[PDB]
Amino acid sequence: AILPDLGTEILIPVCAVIGIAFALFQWLLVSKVKLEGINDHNVVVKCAEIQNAISEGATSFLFTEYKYVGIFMVAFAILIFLFLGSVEGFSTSPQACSYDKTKTCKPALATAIFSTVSFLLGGVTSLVSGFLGMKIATYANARTTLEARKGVGKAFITAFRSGAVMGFLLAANGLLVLYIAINLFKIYYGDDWGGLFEAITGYGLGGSSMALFGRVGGGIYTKAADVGADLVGKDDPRNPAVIADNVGDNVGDIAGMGSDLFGSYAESSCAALVVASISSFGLNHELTAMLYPLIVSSVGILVCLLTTLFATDFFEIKAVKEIEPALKKQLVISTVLMTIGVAVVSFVALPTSFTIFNFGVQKDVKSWQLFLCVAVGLWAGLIIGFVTEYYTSNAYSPVQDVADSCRTGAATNVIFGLALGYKSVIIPIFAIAISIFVSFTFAAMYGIAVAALGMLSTIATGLAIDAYGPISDNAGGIAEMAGMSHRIRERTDALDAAGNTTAAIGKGFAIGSAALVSLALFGAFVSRASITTVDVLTPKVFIGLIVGAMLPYWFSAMTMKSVGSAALKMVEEVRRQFNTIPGLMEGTAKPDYATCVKISTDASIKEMIPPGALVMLTPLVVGILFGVETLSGVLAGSLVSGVQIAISASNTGGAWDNAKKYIEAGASEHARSLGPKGSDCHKAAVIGDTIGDPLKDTSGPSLNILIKLMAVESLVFAPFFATHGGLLFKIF
Amino acid sequence: AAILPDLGTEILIPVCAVIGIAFALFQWLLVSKVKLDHNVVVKCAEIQNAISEGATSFLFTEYKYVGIFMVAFAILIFLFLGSVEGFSTSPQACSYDKTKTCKPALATAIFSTVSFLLGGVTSLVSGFLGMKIATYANARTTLEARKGVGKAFITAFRSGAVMGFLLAANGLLVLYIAINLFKIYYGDDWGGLFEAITGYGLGGSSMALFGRVGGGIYTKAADVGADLVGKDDPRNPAVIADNVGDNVGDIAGMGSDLFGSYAESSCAALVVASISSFGLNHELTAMLYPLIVSSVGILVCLLTTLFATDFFAVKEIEPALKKQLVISTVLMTIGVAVVSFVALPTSFTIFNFGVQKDVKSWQLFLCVAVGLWAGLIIGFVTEYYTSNAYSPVQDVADSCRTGAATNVIFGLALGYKSVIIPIFAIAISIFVSFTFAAMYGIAVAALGMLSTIATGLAIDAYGPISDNAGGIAEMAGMSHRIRERTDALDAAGNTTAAIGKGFAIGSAALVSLALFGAFVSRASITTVDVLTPKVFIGLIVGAMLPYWFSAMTMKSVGSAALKMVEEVRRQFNTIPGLMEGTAKPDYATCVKISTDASIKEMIPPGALVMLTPLVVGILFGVETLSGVLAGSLVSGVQIAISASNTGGAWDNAKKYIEAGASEHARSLGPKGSDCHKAAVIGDTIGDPLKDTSGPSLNILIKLMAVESLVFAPFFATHGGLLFKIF
Ligand SMILES: [Mg+2]
Ligand SMILES: [Mg+2]
Ligand SMILES: [Mg+2]
Ligand SMILES: [Mg+2]
């Protein structure tokens, strides 16, 4: 191809620098809004004091998280090393390659180390970019609320700039760190590109492993705090739970999504390299083709930068009616730009033809067909988000049909909205099915991997809009609580409901991008374990498959009780707060926020530990006791039945949110029809909302790690399961 | 070569069937000796008359469609199985043995159709007669509460045992009769004999699509027609229309479903074994081993039934039902040991995907046994998760002291965790079955679960009767002593019929798979690769179908309950005398509008189940349909268990508070408390999941297979019409 081995390695890390640079420019412009148009004073001081308490509890949350993360990340690094060393008997003797039997590779010990290096790198990059994101989110929240004094547009812009910092840091870092890791490892591995990219494969697992904390644990917290909206018998800052939630608004949708998307990005990029490593590109050693996934991802930053400027600088917002589109336009602009962008990348850095591995054979693949495989992914993303919009927006028919149920009952609001989520799934599945059936065809599993990266090429703006959402729930709450001009409070609540419609898409975007990555890994694991058939007939698989299909249902049952309990742990903790501290319950003194967070945040991560086991140990148990053939069936069942629950769950929970937020909004005859702000309908809608609060933000999103992480886990430990397979079959 | 000879089998079978029949007649007869101060006895009669006007309005408004469909689909089955051989009359070499000659393929097509019609006609009959004992014996329970608990409960449980035996014998007898009228043609073509007999299974499962989806939507469209504005009061026609509903759903629906589950597992045994030792050689009493296992079931359950009629407080009642189960499980292990001894050779071969595989008859006996003891374990694992008695429902009651949001969250939690142990129970059954026999094992082990279907159905059919007994008391304004007696049965009925809901879904996954394997055995596929996208897109979209099919049964029953509140305004506002006091509401009409509404709401989910084989099987291959049939199984079984158990809890949590019979139940439980209101918002969310969206779900799994088994030659012959074009 046209772009040379230099060209890739001088391009990649420019575009990641440009990314990080962009981000720090945007941060600098949000710093320009110091905490003339001040009107009046003392509400500014009141904002400040709420914004502080946000960080008190935010920076609390993180340190209580890390208290387990270091413990976990070492414990596992050991564990990953032992299990990867033991295939070779920790031999220092160069093994003949597990692909081209003839030529000689490095020892699977020296990958046991190099896997355990990248595992730290990844788990640190997920960590850091989420820290930086938590840090900007807590910065911008009041500096938006404030800029709402000046007007809707001027606020939005200095809120979506903030959200952009998160996307571009997260994406750029994940690209940069990976890019470095490849070049530092390529030093030791030399020409053994197969062996090299089996060790990069840990980076995928590292970010995903972390994602388990950020999205399952932090999820269990965020909605513990939200569902910690409990009397008998006192929404005031004087309730620390209230401000524990506004912290959560940031956690479950910045760290939460960010970790999952970083996960979904990284572990897709590894499954794309491990097929191409044992394909044409990696066999011949054609850097700018191995690293095509990165060339794709690196243009993606460049593209998304440009498309971000349409909503930041060229066009600018006037009316609130224009706001929810401006977000959605971004999505189309990028999708559209990226198709042109990745049309060039395909042209300029792939050879016209090559072979792509699958199950022994080298498949022939013309390089336009790889363009179709990212494109199909690119555009299924755009589709699957919009199908979602429809099912989870008060704009469209079906959310309003739910709102009309809460007239008749609270039992009806919930019934109609269970049914809504259930019916949501159809288009996202068929959409996936098509993106598979295109992709499996053109390239093989490398196509499916490419296609998952396809969904995630746009991942800066994709994140930015997801990141914009919780900034505006804080901006909202910082106005409510600081008690501001009803003019301002309307301008925030505008950004709020727009972000609400937007962050349902966000969950959608992810639950498909998962299934695509959790499939990419799955076959890239089969391609490690050297399986070539998986008979649903042969009972070794089927029993594993039916049990695999059950695991999300079980896993869910944990994440459900987890949040339900820990919210009751929050209630008991506020009861304490009032009944120990003096001047709260009176009103002289405030509560201790930091402690509300900590005491609740542990009780979450504790509650996370069993779900986390079921994710992490299912492969180790199944893979040891029964073969890789049986773990194969498990990983398939977890996939098929799991993605269903994930969609239906977080769509029902978005639907009910916006049904309640619709009644509240009163922006139609019908909304007003149901919607006195505390009406009989509003009760049955808001009963519905809190049931959704978990489904939306804890149970459904957690699900897309159970699929993802089980796969990278197995991919990594495929050697170990191959070398010590059915121990329960060895004895019998 | 089998001890009990081919005469001895054929003479034994329909004795048992008729012996069950004769026991059911005897049991209906004894429930007639209960003849129906004053003005309360006529109150009860006034209700019992009105129950029958509603139920018999429903059934007749359903059969408006059942005939219309059965004939239309009969057209369709013949035309499709015909076109396989070009509607040819000239006999064709046997697919099971290339040497010998089989009958012409439209001989199967005609004969499939005959058996399809029989099976529908038996499902229809067994449900019709089942109603006509529930409707009859509901008040005769309430009245007999005037003679205590154990004298009411007996004359209730009998009424359900009648239907359980009537159903059991009828299905066995009609299959048996069909086999001999069919052998009459096929002769030595035992493969092509039992190829037609499987229509019976498709017949029985289609009438479950009417019974427990249409009748499903109705049963809990009425129950959730419990709605203000404005106002148990019989001047509201929905109040009674539900007492018909409590009957229809768990009599006609559980009848039809477990008749279906039975038929299609027995058919799936027959097909497999027709191309194995037994049916290659032509050894009847070894082929018909399924039917011998069944027929002893009747006899074992007849004995056990008498433990809860002749041979033995309100605290005593729930055990009465849980013994009825354990008894006939312990009996039937001996019962089937006998059947396996006296009707099986030392050793044999079973067809799995080409190879005639070594199987020794004791290994076959372990297959019914491992199936038998799954079906015992699985429903006890239910009980634990759906009973006010045990811990996890008592947790859900403590939820409603906090939120009504919390009641539902911790219920959605409940059912989700519910699944784990039943899934291992089903999986452990699978691994042991496939080992010992192969596909025959699974199919036998599914019959192992349904070997106790006589008494199994009795406890499922006692349930709703004793809801009507609790409500016939309430509406007839009876003695408070009497109300605390009938409502005692009601509550143990709520436990028991929740167990039977897990029993059925247990059975289902097993039989769905017995069929799946048999569909692969007919289609001649040696593999089903999860790698090949032909199957993967199948598999993922199979997992999607139940979520779709739920969304429909859900919003069906949702708006259908709101159509029932619409119709109750019309009766109050058009009839002279109602709203005042003069004239009671027309019950026949309040069922009519609601029933059509339900069966019209049914028709699109009833379509999703029915076309999907056809569209997949035609457009794409039997490869793809193999994919789709494995996804819908593994996924839909989870959603099936999650629903009915999530619902079964919230009901029993409400019914715990209402009961108030322990200090903790008093703790939450003023009979309209802050808690009780949250607990009941639970129940009315659980009503569709209880008796509509979860129990229909198992017919999506079941019927998609039998339909696919029957049309598998047509799908091979004119298969991937899209793969073929490119
Ligand atoms: Mg909020
Ligand atoms: Mg909320
Ligand atoms: Mg009732
Ligand atoms: Mg009910």
Author numbering:
A (entry chain A): 4 to 38, 63 to 261, 269 to 766
B (entry chain B): 3 to 38, 67 to 261, 269 to 349, 353 to 766
Article, verbatim:
Membrane-bound pyrophosphatases (M-PPases) are enzymes that couple the synthesis or hydrolysis of pyrophosphate (PPi) to the vectorial transport of protons and/or sodium ions. In addition, M-PPases can be divided into seven functional classes on the basis of their monovalent cation binding (K+-dependent and K+-independent enzymes) and pumping specificity (H+-pumps (H+-PPases), Na+-pumps (Na+-PPases) and H+ and Na+ co-pumps (Na+/H+-PPases)) and on the placement of a ‘semi-conserved glutamate' essential for pumping activity. So far, the structures of two M-PPases have been solved in three different states: TmPPase in resting and product-bound states (TmPPase:Ca:Mg and TmPPase:Pi2, respectively)11 and VrPPase in a substrate-analogue imidodiphosphate (IDP)-bound state (VrPPase:IDP)12. These structures have shown that M-PPases are homodimers, with each protomer having 16 transmembrane helices (TMHs) and a vertically arranged, continuous active site structure with four distinctive parts: ‘hydrolytic centre', ‘coupling funnel', ‘ion gate' and ‘exit channel'3. In this article we present three structures: the Na+-pumping TmPPase with IDP and Na+ bound (TmPPase:IDP) at 3.5 Å resolution, the H+-pumping VrPPase with one phosphate bound (VrPPase:Pi) at 3.5 Å resolution, and the newly refined structure of TmPPase with the phosphate analogue, WO4 bound, at 4 Å resolution (TmPPase:WO4).
